[PDB]
Amino acid sequence: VVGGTEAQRNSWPSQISLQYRSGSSWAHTCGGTLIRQNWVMTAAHCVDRELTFRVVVGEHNLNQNNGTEQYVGVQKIVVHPYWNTDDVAAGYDIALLRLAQSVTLNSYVQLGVLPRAGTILANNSPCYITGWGLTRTNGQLAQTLQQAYLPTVDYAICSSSSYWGSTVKNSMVCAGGDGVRSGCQGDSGGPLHCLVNGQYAVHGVTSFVSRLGCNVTRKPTVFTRVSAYISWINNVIASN
């Protein structure tokens, strides 16, 4: 997250850290959202590679023991059938991970609330992006969870020539673009929490940013629109 600030300890209890094994060590690669005690929602491009993954819930400081973490393996990876690694702009950047065990819910670990199918947010709706991603373009990962106020940019405006043009589709959500705040590498797969009816719900899965950089004016962070995949999500969790 570029231009963010440290989040209150465990104030976004559904946020998870997706890590892979590198030799004998583990490294953070993406964010995610705990939607069930044994199911995680993240980005498809986060699990394209065949690596050993693990999920960490109740996390805050990646390099220190906060006394609230729970580590669990990933036993199954279900990527959306239409996902294309060579065309992220085609959408469908979403995947569900079945955990090897059910985590224990508490003050620091809670399920994320999903919106009702087809829900579209009005322009400039209040939302927050969270993650341990890069704090600067080509910079380094954050040690502690970061958050940044990132209001939405409606489709009509985001898909205009003065912004993303045709690169953005209706199955995505755009937020930010003030040239100061945004998502960045490492935030991918993470949530975009938006305030709706007095409650925070996960309306987006961080998908991509500009090649020119993370925080670029008129180039909002692009998110997979969760409300367009509710039936798919339900069908997967009801079968496996």
50 is in an annotated binding site: no
205: Cα within 13 Å, side-chain hemisphere: 31
Can you give the length of the chain in residues?
240
Marked catalytic residue, from 45, 60, 193, 203: 45
Does residue 68 bind Ca ion (CB under 5 A)? no
59 is in an annotated binding site: yes
* H or E stretch at 53: strand 53-57
Q: Are strands 191-196 and 172-175 parallel, antiparallel or unpaired?
A: unpaired
61, 70, 119, 171: which one binds Ca ion (CB under 5 A):
61
The answer to whether 146 and 132 have CB atoms below 8 angstroms apart is: yes
Q: Which stretch binds Ca ion (CB under 5 A): 23-31, 55-63, 99-107, 187-195?
A: 55-63
Q: Which residues inside 120-139 make contact with Ca ion, applying CB under 5 A?
A: none
37, 38, 66, 70: which one binds Ca ion (CB under 5 A):
66
* H or E stretch at 230: helix 230-239
The answer to whether 214 and 182 have CB atoms below 8 angstroms apart is: yes
6 is in an annotated binding site: no
Q: Which two tokens stand for residue 27?
A: 């490294």
Q: How far is CA 110 from CA 152, 160, 169, 181, 216, in A?
A: 25, 38, 31, 27, 33
Active site residue 188: yes
| Beta carbon of residue 90, minimum distance to Ca ion (angstroms, whole number) | 36
Active site residue 93: yes
Does residue 37 bind Ca ion (CB under 5 A)? no
Does residue 143 bind Ca ion (CB under 5 A)? no
Size of the site for Ca ion (CB under 5 A): 2
Contact positions vs Ca ion (CB under 5 A): 61, 66
What residues form the annotated binding site for Ca(2+)? 59, 61, 64, 69
Catalytic residues: 45, 93, 188
What residues form the annotated binding site? 59, 61, 64, 69
